[PDB]
Design a binder for this molecule. Structure first.
Ligand SMILES: [Mg+2]
Ligand SMILES: [Zn+2]
Ligand SMILES: [Zn+2]
Lengths: 67, 1339, 96, 278, 97, 49
DNA sequence: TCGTCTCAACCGAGACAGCATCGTGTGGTTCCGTCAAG
DNA sequence: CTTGACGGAACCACACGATGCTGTAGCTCGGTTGAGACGA
C-alpha cells in the first residue's frame, strides 16, 4: 500500500537499473499503450511503476518487448 | 546533439566568419526616439531586432518570414532570441596582442621567447625596441634595444633589418617563430643541462612546444586583428522610470574602444609620425586591457562615482572572486523560501504543506489535470479560479498531493542530507510542517531560518528522487555506521522513564498475562510504569533464513520493558532492550535492526517508536527545577581550602622564593584538579539523589531527577556542562594565550558576581569567535576539497588485480583508542586472511564484511587485516566498485555509477564546524610483549639495549591481538624480555628524553684517538670535586687547527689485538661529539652496552588544512635517504651533509640539512628509511620519497583519526583514502626516451603507454616513473579540462593554457557536464553514454 | 513562484515581474544532488527548469498531451558559453 | 626595479620636445604648405607642452587622460594639416581652439551611453552652467521652475531637456559598501520572456484553433482570412472580395455574427470579461 | 522543552518561570481580594507582607488609601513587576518565600 | 550605542582574523561582549556599556 | 673555478557660429472598415 | 438581398529644426622570480 523500494533493493542489490525500468514503465503507462498489472489504489503512475518494479513482474527484456 | 568539446586557437578569418558585421559608430540609442540606428552597438543589421518578428525601419511586422532581408535596411527579420546568437566585430588596422597571456601568473610569451615579462611589456609600452628576422646581425630576434640602440643598429646595417614595436612585431615573430621546428633545439639542449631554475623554464617551454605541436593551430593566431563585440542583449538598455536607462559598464568600454579605433582609422591616413602612432597604439593597448580585465594597471574610473568599471572578466565571472556567473548565482524556477515547523502527527513517508504554496508548486500538474478532466480547457480561467480561491480547487488538487514527491533544501547547505523527499498533505496556514526525526539529519534546529522548496517537473525526476533522497533510503550516514536519523531528547526520555528498576512502587511482584494485557493493566491507573513484575513474551527469532520460530522466555523485565517490546516487532530479541536506553545505546539498536532487516521494516518501526516515545514523553512528568541542582556542602569547604592555599601561594610569591611561571603552572593544574574533583563529586551527588525504601529503612538506587536522566542519556550535552550549572564552572583561559588564576567560587544556582562573569565572558567571546569563523573556514576548505574529488566515477565492476593496504587500529597511548571493528565495518577483503595456526583460511574470496563478520573477527584474534583499497587500483580514469566498501546509504555493496568522491569529501566537510614527556613507558593492561622491526642486543647485566629507533613496542593480549602500541626511540632500555608473562602497570621500556646514552657492541679496553686537551677535549673540574671527567669542546668554540679533527674512541682487546664488530670491516670505534662527558677513562675494560657518554637533549582547522594541502610546515622533519649506515660529512662548512653509506647499494648523492634544525642523528648508527630524526611533522609528499604508499597512508589515517576522535564524530578511512588516491593520481618521470626528463602526467596514461610500448617494434621504449603526491590547490590544475578548471582558478591563466594547449578533450568529468546541463556520466547516464559510444565511431 | 521571467545573460528566472525569485542553486546544492549515484535529475533540473529555448515548450507539451519521449535537444547555456569563448577567437568544432 | 606604467613612459618620451623661437615654427609652416614630411613631423613632435597643459585642465571626467592627450594631438595635427600661413600669427591659439573643439567632441561622444548631437549638448551645457550660476545664490537644490523662469523657456520644455540627462551608474556598484548582490539579477526585461506568457500564447493559439475547427467552415474561413491567423496574410474583405465574398456588408455581417457566436460559446465555456482581463 | 537548561547553559529559565508563578499567584490573590470586597487595611497589610522580604527595601506607609492605593490596585491587577540587578540579584530563598 | 570596526579607515569582516575578535580585561565597564549581532560578524562590532 | 640547489621577497585569492542635407511630425488625399437605410 | 456616409490607417510631399561636418590664430596562504652557496 506504501511506496517500498526495499523489496527491489534486497532483490537486485543494484539501485541503478530499476530507475530506468520504472522510467520506461511510467512512460508506457502515461502513453496509454500498456495497461498496469497491479490495480490503482488512488495513486499516480509513479507508485504503480515502483510497485511493479518491487513486485518483480516487469524486467528489462519484458519492458524491451513491451516497447 | 554535440560532441568534441575542445579548445583551439583560431585565425582572424574564422573570427570574421563567426562575426556578422563591422561596427564603426558609437550609436547605442537615438536621442530623438527610442529606436537604435545602424552600424552601432545596438544595431539591427549585425545582431537583429529588438522585438519579436519586426524590422528596424518598421516595414515588415508579420510572422511568416524568418530568413528574409529587407530592402531599406540590411537586417534579417527573426525572433527576439536572435540577439543572443549573432555578434559583431571590430577591425584592427594594427593587430593588438592579448594581455591575458601576459598579466597572469605565467607569461607564456616570455616562455616561448625565452624572455621575462618586463621586456615583453616594455616593447608594448613603447620604451624599448625589438627586431624581427635578424639573420646576419650582432643582436638576434630575442635581444632588446632602446631608441638610440635601434637607431645605431639601423645605421650600422642599412639593409636586412626590420625594427618594429608594439604587437605587430609580436605577430611577426609568432608568424616566423617555427614552433614545429624550434622544439628540436630545446629537446637537444634539455639533456645538456640538469639545473632546477633553468630546467623548469625548459620544461614549461617543451610543454608549450608539445602543446603547439599537438594543437594543430598556428602560433600567429594569438595576436588578433579582428576583435568581436559583446552581444547587445547580454548588456542591458531598457527604459527606466522617468525616461532613464540602465546600462552596464561593458557598453561603455566597448564604445570607448570603438571610438579609439575610429580615431586610429582617422589618424592612419594623414602620413602620421612615429611618436603619435606609438601613443595611439599604446592607448589602444590599455583600452583593450581595460576591455578584458580591471584592477591591474589601467584603474579606469567612471563619471560621478568611485567604483571602477566592469570588464568582460566581470561578465564571464561577475562577483565573488574568480567564479563564473553561472557558478556564483543560479535562481532555479519552481522554488520559494519558507519557514519550517515540526509536525508530530505525520509518518516518515509523508509530511505537511500549506495550501497557499500548494496551489502554485503543483501548477503545471493542476493545469494538466484541469485540461484533461474536462472542467476548464483554458489556462487564464484556470489562473482566475486558482487566484479566486474556489471551493473545487482543493478537490481537484488533492489528487497530486497524496502520491507526489516534493524536495526541500536548507538555504545554508551543510551536507548531503539537507535535501530530502517527502509527501505533502492538505493543511491550513502559511508555513510548512516537517518530520521530527529528520531535523537531526538536517543539522537544523527549529530556529526560524529560511528553507526553500523544490518541485521537479517530470514524473521521472519524482521517481528517481523517491529512489535517491527519499527518507526510507538515506538512513545510514555517510560518515560512519551510525544512522543519520538520530533520536532526540523526548523519545529517549520516554524510553528512560519508561524502563526503570524501581525499589518501591504500587504493584511490586505482580504477574502479567501478556504484552497487551500489561498495556491494559498499566493504563488502568493502579499499576506503575517502573515495578519489579513478571511477564511472558511471545518472541520470534529471525536467526534462520526464511523461518521465524516462536518461543517463550521467562525474564525479569519491568512494566516499561514489556511496553517497550510491545512496540518493538518480532525481528528483535527481548534481551537487547534490557539496558538503560542511552542515546548511543538506542543508536546502536536502530543501526543493528536496520542492518538485520533492511529498510522498510526499519522505517515502519521508526514511526511507531517515535509515536510511543511521544506519548510516553507526554504522559511523563519530569522537569528541571531548583531542587534538581543539588549543591554539596563540601564544595564551599573545597573553595575555602583552595582560597587559603592560593593565599599561601601569593604570600610565598611576594616573599621572594619562586618566580611567576612556577606558581602559574601550580595554579593552572591545581585549579583543574579541584575542578574535576568537584565534577566527580557532582556525579556522586547526582547519582545518589534518591531516598526510597520498600519494607525497609533505606535503599539506594539511581536518582529520579531530570538532570541525572539527561546526564546518563546524553542526548544533547555532556557531563562537563553541569559543572557550570551546579559545581565549579571551570577555568576559562584568556584569549591572549594565558589562563586566569582566580576560580569561579559561585555557580549558576547561587549566583555569580561581576568578576567571575568577566572571566567567563572572555571564553564565551572566544567560543563565539571560533563558531563564527569555523563555518567560513570549513566552507573555504570544502570548496576545494570536493572540487578536487569530482572525478571519482565508477565504470568498472571487477578488474582482477591483487593489491591492498593494511589497516591497523589506533592503539596509541595506554589502551586502544579506535577498535578494529569500528574501522573495517562495511569494507571488503582484499586477499585471504592468515590464521595464527597452519594452513587455516577463513574465506578465499573478497566477500563483504556484514554484521556477522565483525563479531566473527572479534571472536578471532586477528589484527593485521588487509582491505581492498582503491589507492592501488588498475582501472583507468575512475575507480572500480569492487574496491569501494559498503559505506553508503544502502546496506548492500556499492554498484556502477556512484560518485564516491563527493560523499568522501562531504564526510570531512560536515563536522568541520564543530571543531575548535616520554620519560617512562608504562603499560595499562596485562599483555605479552611483541617485538616488531627492532634490532637489539642483550647486555651482560641482563638488560636489553635497542640501537634501532624504528622499533615499536606492541603489547599483544592473551589471545594474540595487539591492544597497545608504543614508540621506542634509540638507546632505550628494555627491562622485560620477549616471550614472558604479562604484568599490568609494570615498566617495560625506559628512555631518557633528557640524556642520550651511547651503548656499545664489543668489549675490551678503549683508546681515544684524535683527542687534544685544548682543541677537542678540555679538563673541566667542578666545585668541591663535583665532576672529574673529560669535557669535549664545541665545534664553534674549538681552535682553527682542531676544527676539522674528530675524536674516535677506538675499542680493542686487553692483550693488544684489534677488535672489530661483526658484519662490517671497520672496527667498532665510537666518535666523541660536542657537549659530551666520558664516564670511564681510556685504557680500562668496558663491557658491551655500557653508557660511554651523556648527551643532553597546532590542531583543528589549520592542521587539517596543512595535511590536506600536502605542504611543508614551518619546521619539517628531515629523514635519512637510504636504509643503512648513517654517517656525518661536512660539519663547519655551512650546512650538515649527512651522508648515507649502505651495505647493498651506495649512492654518491647526500641530502642536505640546515643548521637551524636540530639533528638527532647518531654518528655511525644504522638509521633506516622509516626512522624520523628531526622534531616536528613530516608532510605526506615529503614522506612519499623513501618508503612508499602504505606507511604514508597509515600515517595519514592516523593523523586524521586522532584529531577527529577527540571531537566525538567518527569517520571511516575510505573517505580520505579515495581523495588520497585522487591527489596521488598524477606522478612524474625521471627518464627520457619516450617523454622528457621532468614532466607531470597521470599514472594511467603512463601505464597504457608502457602497455603499448612493451608490445611493438622495440623491446622497452618506456621507462620507470616516480610517485609524487599533490595537495588540493595543484592536483586539480593538472587536468585535461578547461571549463572545469575555469571555475575555481583564474580564467586568465587556464583559458590561455587551453588556447595554447589544443587538447581535444572529451566529456569526461562532472563539472564539464553540470556547466552546460547535458547527460551526466556518473549515475543513470551509463545507458546513454554506452549508446553514444556505440553510435559514435562504432558499428 | 511557479514560472518566472528569465534573465538577459542566460535563461534563468529572476524577480521584477511582480513575483519573487527562487533560491540559489549554487555549487553545494548540485554537489549534494550528485552525492548519490544519479544522473537524470541533474540534467532535468538544468535543461528543463532553466537554460533552454524549445525544451521547456516540448516538455510542457508532453506534460499536457500525456505521452513522454524525453528528447535531449540543445540547451542555451552551451550557446552562451560558445559565444563568450568565440569572443576571444577560439576554434571549437564538433567531430561526430 | 622600474615602473611598469604608461603615463610615466609617455612623460619621459615627451621630454625631447624642443621649444625654439617662433621663426622656426614659421619656417615649418612654410615648408608644410608646399608638402614635405618633416615640418609636419616637427610640429607634431615639438608642440606637446600646450597639449598636456590643455589636457590637465579637463581632469576628473568620464574619460582617461590618454584620451585627452590623444584628442589634443589629434586637434593639433588637424590644425597644422589645413594650416594657412597667410595670417602670420601664432598657431598655438589655433591648436588651442582645435583642441577645445576636439575635447568638446570627446565630452559629447565619450561620456554618456546615449549619443547626442552638438546642439542638444550645447543647450544642456548652457543650462547646467545657468543652474550652477543660480544655485550659488539660491543655496538649495536646483529645480526646473527657476531655470525656466531665468532662461525664458517653458517648464515642460526644459523638463524634457533635463530628462535626456540620464547619468547611468554601474550594474555592480550596489547600495552600500558590502556588495553581496549586484543589480544584474534585480531587474528583468520589459518584453514577455516568461514561460507563463509564451505558454498562455500557445495555449490560446491551440484553443482558438480548436474553436475555429469546431465552428462552421465559412465562419472559420472569414475569421482566419481577415485577421491572418491560420496561415493567411494581412488581407481583408477589400482584398478577399474575389476570394470569399463579393459584398462587403454581407461578409461584415457574417464576421460580426461569427464574433457573437464565439462570444456566446466563450460565455458557455466559462470565459467572461472579468475572468480574462481581471 | 527541558533541554534549554542543560544544553544551553542558562538556568534562568527555571528561576524566571518560578518567579512568574509566584507573581501570578500574588496577582490572582489580589484579584480575588478585590473581588471579595475587603477593606483598605487588609490591602495595606497585604502590601506590607509582600514588601518586607529579605532583599530590597520597603516604600510603604506613604501612599494615600483613597487615590493611590486604588490606582496601584487597578494598575497592578494584571501582574506585578520585579526589579533585579544583573550580578547581585535575587537569591533563591526569597523566591522560596 | 553600536561600536562597529567596519567602514572607512577600519577593519572589515575579512580583515578581522583572530586579533580584533578577542577581548582584554581592560574592558571592565567599557565594552560589553554580550551585545553583538549574530551571523558573519561577531567580535568586531561591539556595544557601549 | 662554475652549474645547480635552496632561499626570501612579489603577487594574487576567499565656445561660437555657419554650412549641406535629413527624418520623422503634420497634414494630404486616398483606401479601408464600419454604420444606418430600405 | 441592394444603396450611400464618417472615423481610422497608409504611404507620401512639405517641412522645421536637426543630424553631420567645418573654420577662428593668447586577513592566511599558495605559485613566481632574483639571489647566495656548495661540490666536481
Ligand atoms: Mg536555526
Ligand atoms: Zn524592414
Ligand atoms: Zn582496483
Amino acid at each position: 500500500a506504501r511506496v517500498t523500494v526495499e523489496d527491489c533493493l534486497d532483490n537486485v542489490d543494484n539501485r541503478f537499473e530499476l530507475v530506468m525500468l520504472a522510467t520506461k514503465r511510467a512512460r508506457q503507462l502515461a502513453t496509454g499503450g500498456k495497461e498496469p498489472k497491479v490495480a490503482w489504489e488512488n495513486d499516480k503512475p509513479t507508485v504503480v511503476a515502483l510497485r511493479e518494479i518491487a513486485s518483480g513482474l516487469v524486467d528489462e527484456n519484458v519492458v524491451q518487448q513491451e516497447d | 546533439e554535440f560532441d568534441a568539446i575542445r579548445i583551439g586557437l583560431a585565425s582572424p578569418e574564422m573570427i570574421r566568419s563567426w562575426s556578422f558585421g563591422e561596427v564603426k559608430k558609437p550609436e547605442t540609442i537615438n536621442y530623438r526616439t527610442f529606436k537604435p540606428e545602424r552600424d552601432g552597438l545596438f544595431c539591427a543589421k549585425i545582431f537583429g531586432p529588438v522585438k519579436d518578428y519586426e524590422c528596424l525601419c518598421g516595414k515588415y511586422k508579420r510572422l511568416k518570414h524568418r530568413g528574409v532581408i529587407c530592402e531599406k535596411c540590411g537586417v534579417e527579420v527573426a525572433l527576439a532570441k536572435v540577439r543572443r546568437e549573432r555578434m559583431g566585430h571590430i577591425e584592427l588596422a594594427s593587430p593588438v596582442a592579448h594581455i591575458w597571456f601576459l598579466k597572469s601568473l605565467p607569461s607564456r610569451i616570455g616562455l616561448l621567447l625565452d624572455m621575462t615579462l618586463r621586456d615583453i611589456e616594455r616593447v608594448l609600452y613603447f620604451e624599448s625596441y625589438v627586431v624581427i628576422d635578424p639573420g646576419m646581425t650582432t643582436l638576434e630576434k630575442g635581444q632588446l634595444l632602446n631608441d638610440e640602440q635601434y637607431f645605431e643598429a639601423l645605421e650600422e646595417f642599412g639593409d636586412d633589418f626590420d625594427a618594429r614595436m608594439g604587437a605587430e612585431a609580436v605577430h611577426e615573430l609568432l608568424n616566423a617563430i617555427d614552433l614545429e621546428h624550434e622544439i628540436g633545439r630545446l629537446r637537444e639542449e634539455i639533456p645538456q643541462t640538469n639545473s632546477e631554475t633553468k630546467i623548469k623554464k625548459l620544461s614549461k617551454r617543451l610543454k608549450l612546444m608539445e602543446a603547439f605541436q599537438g594543437s594543430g593551430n598556428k602560433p600567429e593566431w594569438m595576436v588578433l586583428t579582428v576583435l568581436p563585440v559583446l552581444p547587445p542583449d547580454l548588456r542591458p538598455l531598457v527604459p527606466l522610470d522617468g525616461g532613464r536607462f540602465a546600462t552596464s559598464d561593458l557598453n561603455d568600454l566597448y564604445r570607448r574602444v570603438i571610438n579609439r579605433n575610429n580615431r586610429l582609422k582617422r589618424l592612419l591616413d594623414l602620413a602620421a609620425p612615429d611618436i603619435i602612432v606609438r601613443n595611439e597604439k599604446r592607448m589602444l593597448q590599455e583600452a583593450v586591457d581595460a576591455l578584458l580585465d580591471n584592477g591591474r594597471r589601467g584603474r579606469a574610473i567612471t563619471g560621478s562615482n568611485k567604483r571602477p568599471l566592469k570588464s568582460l572578466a566581470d561578465m564571464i565571472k561577475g562577483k565573488q572572486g574568480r567564479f563564473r556567473q553561472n557558478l556564483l548565482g543560479k535562481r532555479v524556477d519552481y522554488s520559494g523560501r519558507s519557514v519550517i515547523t515540526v509536525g508530530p502527527t505525520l509518518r516518515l513517508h509523508q509530511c505537511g504543506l500549506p495550501k497557499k504554496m500548494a496551489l502554485e508548486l503543483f501548477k503545471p500538474f493542476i493545469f494538466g489535470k484541469l485540461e484533461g478532466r474536462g472542467m476548464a480547457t483554458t489556462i487564464k480561467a484556470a489562473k482566475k479560479m486558482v487566484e479566486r480561491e474556489l471551493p473545487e480547487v482543493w478537490d481537484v488538487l488533492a489528487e497530486v498531493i497524496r502520491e507526489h514527491p516534493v524536495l526541500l533544501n536548507r538555504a545554508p547547505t551543510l551536507h548531503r542530507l539537507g535535501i530530502q523527499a517527502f509527501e505533502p498533505v492538505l493543511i491550513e496556514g502559511k508555513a510548512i510542517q516537517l518530520h521530527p526525526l529528520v531535523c537531526a539529519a538536517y543539522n537544523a534546529d527549529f530556529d526560524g531560518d529560511q528553507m526553500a522548496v523544490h518541485v521537479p517537473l517530470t514524473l521521472e525526476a519524482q521517481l528517481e528522487a523517491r529512489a535517491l533522497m527519499m527518507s526510507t533510503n538515506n538512513i545510514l550516514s555517510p560518515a560512519n555506521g551510525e544512522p543519520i536519523i538520530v533520536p532526540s531528547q523526548d523519545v529517549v526520555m520516554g524510553l528512560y522513564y519508561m524502563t526503570r528498576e524501581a525499589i518501591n512502587a504500587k504493584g511490586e511482584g505482580m504477574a502479567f498475562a501478556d504484552l497487551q494485557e500489561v498495556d491494559r493493566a498499566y493504563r488502568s491507573g493502579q499499576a506503575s510504569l517502573h515495578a519489579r513484575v513478571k511477564v511472558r513474551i511471545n518472541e520470534k527469532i529471525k536467526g534462520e533464513d526464511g523461518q521465524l520460530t516462536a518461543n517463550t522466555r521467562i525474564v525479569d523485565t519491568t512494566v516499561g520493558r514489556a511496553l517497550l517490546f510491545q512496540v518493538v516487532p518480532a525481528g528483535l530479541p527481548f534481551d537487547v532492550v534490557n539496558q538503560s536506553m542511552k542515546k548511543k545505546a538506542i543508536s546502536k539498536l536502530i543501526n543493528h535492526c536496520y542492518r538485520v532487516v533492511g529498510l522498510k521494516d526499519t522505517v515502519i518501526f521508526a514511526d511507531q517508536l517515535m509515536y510511543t516515545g511521544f506519548a510516553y514523553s507526554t504522559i511523563s512528568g519530569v522537569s528541571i527545577g531548583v531542587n534538581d541542582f543539588v549543591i554539596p556542602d563540601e564544595k564551599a569547604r573545597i573553595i575555602n581550602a583552595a582560597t587559603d592555599e592560593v593565599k599561601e601561594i601569593e604570600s610565598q610569591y611576594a616573599s621572594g622564593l619562586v618566580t611567576q611561571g612556577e606558581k602559574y603552572n601550580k595554579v593552572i593544574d591545581l585549579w583543574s584538579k579541584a575542578n574535576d574533583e568537584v565534577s566527580k563529586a557532582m556525579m556522586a551527588n547526582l547519582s545518589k539523589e534518591k531516598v526510597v525504601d520498600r519494607e525497609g529503612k533505606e535503599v539506594d538506587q539511581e536518582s529520579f531527577n531530570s538532570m541525572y536522566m539527561m546526564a546518563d542519556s546524553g542526548a544533547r550535552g555532556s557531563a562537563a556542562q553541569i559543572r557550570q550549572l551546579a559545581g565549579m564552572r571551570g577555568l576559562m583561559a584568556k584569549p591572549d594565550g594565558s589562563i586566569i588564576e582566580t576560580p569561579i567560587t559561585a555557580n549558576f544556582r547561587e549566583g555569580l558576581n561581576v568578576l567571575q562573569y568577566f572571566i567567563s565572558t572572555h571564553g564565551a567571546r572566544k567560543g563565539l569567535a571560533d563558531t563564527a569563523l569555523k563555518t567560513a573556514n570549513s566552507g573555504y576548505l570544502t570548496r576545494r576539497l570536493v572540487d578536487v574529488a569530482q572525478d571519482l566515477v565508477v565504470t568498472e565492476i571487477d578488474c582482477g588485480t591483487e593489491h591492498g593496504l593494511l589497516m591497523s587500529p589506533h592503539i596509541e597511548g595506554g589502551d586502544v583508542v579506535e577498535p578494529l571493528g569500528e574501522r573495517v565495518l562495511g569494507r571488503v577483503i582484499a586477499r585471504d586472511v592468515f590464521k595464527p595456526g597452519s594452513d587455516e583460511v577463513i574465506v578465499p574470496a573478497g566477500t563483504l564484511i556484514d554484521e556477522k563478520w565483525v563479531d566473527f573477527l572479534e571472536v578471532m584474534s586477528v589484527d593485521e587485516v588487509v582491505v581492498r583499497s582503491p589507492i592501488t587500483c588498475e582501472t583507468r580514469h575512475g575507480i572500480c566498485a569492487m574496491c569501494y566498501g559498503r559505506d553508503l546509504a544502502r546496506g548492500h555493496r556499492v554498484n556502477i555509477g556512484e560518485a564516491v568522491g563527493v560523499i568522501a569529501a562531504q564526510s570531512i566537510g560536515e563536522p568541520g564546524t564543530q571543531l575548535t614527556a616520554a620519560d617512562n613507558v608504562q603499560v595499562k593492561n596485562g599483555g605479552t610483549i611483541r617485538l616488531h622491526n627492532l634490532k637489539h642486543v642483550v647486555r651482560a647485566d641482563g638488560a636489553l639495549v635497542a640501537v634501532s629507533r624504528s622499533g615499536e613496542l606492541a603489547v599483544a593480549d592473551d589471545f594474540g591481538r595487539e591492544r597497545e602500541r608504543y614508540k621506542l626511540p634509540y638507546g632505550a632500555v628494555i627491562s622485560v624480555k620477549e616471550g614472558d608473562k604479562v604484568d599490568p602497570g609494570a615498566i617495560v621500556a625506559k628512555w631518557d628524553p633528557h640524556t642520550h646514552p651511547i651503548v656499545t657492541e664489543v668489549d675490551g679496553t678503549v683508546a681515544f684517538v684524535g683527542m687534544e686537551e685544548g682543541i677537542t677535549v678540555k679538563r673541566q673540574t667542578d666545585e668541591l670535586t663535583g665532576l672529574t671527567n673529560i669535557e669535549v669542546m664545541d665545534p664553534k668554540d674549538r681552535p682553527a687547527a682542531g676544527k676539522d679533527i674528530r675524536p674516535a674512541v677506538k675499542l680493542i682487546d686487553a692483550a693488544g689485538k684489534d677488535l672489530l664488530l661483526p658484519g662490517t670491516d671497520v672496527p667498532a670505534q665510537y666518535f666523541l661529539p660536542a657537549n659530551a662527558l666520558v664516564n670511564l677513562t681510556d685504557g680500562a675494560k668496558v663491557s658491551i652496552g655500557d653508557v660511554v657518554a651523556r648527551i643532553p637533549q597546532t590542531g583543528g582547522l589549520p592542521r587539517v588544512a596543512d595535511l590536506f594541502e600536502a605542504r611543508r610546515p614551518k619546521e619539517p622533519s628531515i629523514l635519512a635517504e637510504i636504509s643503512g649506515t648513517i654517517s656525518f660529512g661536512k660539519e663547519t662548512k655551512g650546512k650538515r651533509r649527512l651522508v648515507i653509506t649502505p651495505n647493498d647499494g651506495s649512492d654518491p648523492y647526500e641530502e642536505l640539512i640546515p643548521k637551524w634544525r636540530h639533528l638527532n642523528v647518531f654518528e655511525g648508527e644504522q638509521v633506516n628509511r622509516g626512522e624520523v630524526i628531526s622534531d616536528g611533522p613530516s608532510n605526506p609528499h615529503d614522506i612519499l620519497r623513501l618508503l612508499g604508499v602504505s606507511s604514508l597512508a597509515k600515517y595519514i589515517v592516523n593523523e586524521i583519526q586522532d584529531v577527529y576522535r577527540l571531537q566525538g564524530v567518527k569517520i571511516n578511512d575510505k573517505h580520505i583514502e579515495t581523495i588520497l588516491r585522487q591527489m596521488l593520481r598524477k606522478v612524474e618521470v625521471s627518464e627520457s626516451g619516450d617523454s622528457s626528463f621532468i614532466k607531470g602526467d597521470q599514472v594511467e596514461l603512463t601505464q597504457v603507454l608502457e602497455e603499448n610500448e612493451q608490445l611493438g617494434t622495440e623491446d622497452k621504449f618506456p621507462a620507470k616513473y616516480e610517485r609524487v603526491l599533490l595537495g588540493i590547490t595543484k592536483a586539480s590544475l593538472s587536468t585535461e579540462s578547461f571549463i572545469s578548471a575555469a571555475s575555481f582558478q583564474e580564467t586568465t591563466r587556464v583559458l590561455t593554457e587551453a588556447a595554447v594547449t589544443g587538447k581535444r578533450d572529451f566529456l569526461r568529468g562532472l563539472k564539464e557536464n553540470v556547466v552546460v546541463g547535458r547527460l551526466i556520466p556518473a549515475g543513470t547516464g551509463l545507458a546513454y553514454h554506452s549508446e553514444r559510444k556505440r553510435q559514435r565511431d562504432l558499428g | 513562484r511557479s514560472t518566472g521571467s528569465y534573465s538577459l545573460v542566460t535563461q534563468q528566472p529572476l524577480g521584477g515581474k511582480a513575483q519573487f525569485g527562487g533560491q540559489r542553486f549554487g555549487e553545494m546544492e548540485v554537489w549534494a544532488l550528485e552525492a548519490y549515484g544519479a544522473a537524470y535529475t541533474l540534467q532535468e533540473m538544468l535543461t528543463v527548469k532553466s537554460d533552454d529555448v524549445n525544451g521547456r515548450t516540448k516538455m510542457y507539451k508532453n506534460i499536457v498531451d500525456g505521452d513522454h519521449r524525453m528528447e535531449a535537444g540543445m540547451p542555451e547555456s552551451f550557446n552562451v558559453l560558445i559565444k563568450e569563448i568565440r569572443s576571444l577567437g577560439i576554434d571549437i568544432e564538433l567531430e561526430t | 626595479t622600474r615602473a611598469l606604467d604608461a603615463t610615466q613612459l609617455y612623460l619621459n618620451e615627451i621630454g625631447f620636445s624642443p621649444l625654439l623661437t617662433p621663426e622656426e615654427e614659421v619656417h615649418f609652416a612654410r615648408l608644410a604648405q608646399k608638402g614635405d614630411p618633416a615640418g609636419r613631423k616637427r610640429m607634431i613632435e615639438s608642440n606637446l607642452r600646450l597639449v598636456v597643459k590643455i589636457a590637465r585642465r579637463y581632469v576628473n571626467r568620464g574619460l582617461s587622460l590618454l584620451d585627452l592627450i590623444e584628442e589634443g594631438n589629434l586637434g593639433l595635427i588637424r590644425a597644422v594639416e589645413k594650416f594657412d600661413p597667410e595670417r602670420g600669427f601664432r598657431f598655438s591659439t589655433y591648436a588651442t581652439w582645435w583642441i577645445r573643439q576636439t575635447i568638446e567632441r570627446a565630452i559629447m561622444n565619450q561620456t554618456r551611453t546615449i549619443r547626442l548631437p552638438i546642439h542638444v549638448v550645447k543647450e544642456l551645457n548652457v543650462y547646467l552652467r545657468a543652474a550652477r550660476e543660480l544655485t550659488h545664490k539660491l543655496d538649495h537644490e536646483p529645480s526646473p521652475e527657476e531655470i525656466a523662469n531665468l532662461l525664458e523657456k517653458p517648464v515642460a520644455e526644459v523638463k524634457r531637456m533635463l530628462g535626456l540627462n540620464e547619468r547611468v551608474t554601474s550594474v555592480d556598484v550596489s547600495l552600500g559598501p558590502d556588495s553581496d548582490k549586484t543589480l544584474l539579477d534585480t531587474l528583468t526585461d520589459d518584453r514577455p520572456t516568461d514561460p507563463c506568457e509564451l505558454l498562455q500564447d500557445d495555449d490560446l493559439s491551440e484553443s482558438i484553433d480548436q474553436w475555429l475547427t469546431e465552428l462552421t467552415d465559412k465562419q472559420r474561413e472569414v475569421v482566419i482570412r481577415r485577421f491572418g491567423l491560420r496561415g493567411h496574410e494581412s488581407s481583408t474583405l477589400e482584398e478577399v472580395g474575389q476570394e470569399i465574398g463579393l459584398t462587403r456588408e454581407r461578409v461584415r455581417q457574417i464576421q460580426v455574427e461569427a464574433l457573437k457566436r464565439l462570444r456566446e460559446i466563450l460565455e458557455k465555456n466559462g470565459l467572461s470579461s472579468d475572468a480574462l482581463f481581471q | 522543552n527541558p533541554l534549554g537548561v542543560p544544553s544551553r547553559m542558562n538556568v534562568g529559565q527555571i528561576l524566571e518561570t518560578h518567579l512568574g508563578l509566584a507573581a501570578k499567584g500574588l496577582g490572582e490573590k489580589i484579584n480575588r481580594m478585590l473581588e471579595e470586597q475587603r477593606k483598605v487595611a487588609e490591602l495595606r497589610k497585604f502590601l506590607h507582607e509582600i514588601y518586607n522580604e529579605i532583599g530590597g527595601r520597603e516604600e510603604n506607609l506613604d501612599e494615600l488609601g483613597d487615590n493611590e492605593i486604588l490606582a496601584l490596585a487597578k494598575n497592578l491587577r494584571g501582574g506585578v513587576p520585579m526589579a533585579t540587578p544583573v550580578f547581585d540579584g535575587a537569591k533563591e530563598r526569597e523566591i522560596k518565600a | 550605542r553600536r561600536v562597529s570596526a567596519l567602514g572607512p579607515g577600519g577593519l572589515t569582516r575579512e580583515r578581522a582574523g583572530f586579533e580584533v575578535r578577542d577581548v582584554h580585561p581592560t574592558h571592565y565597564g567599557r565594552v560589553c561582549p554580550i551585545e553583538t549581532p549574530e551571523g558573519p560578524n561577531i567580535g568586531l562590532i561591539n556595544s557601549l556599556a
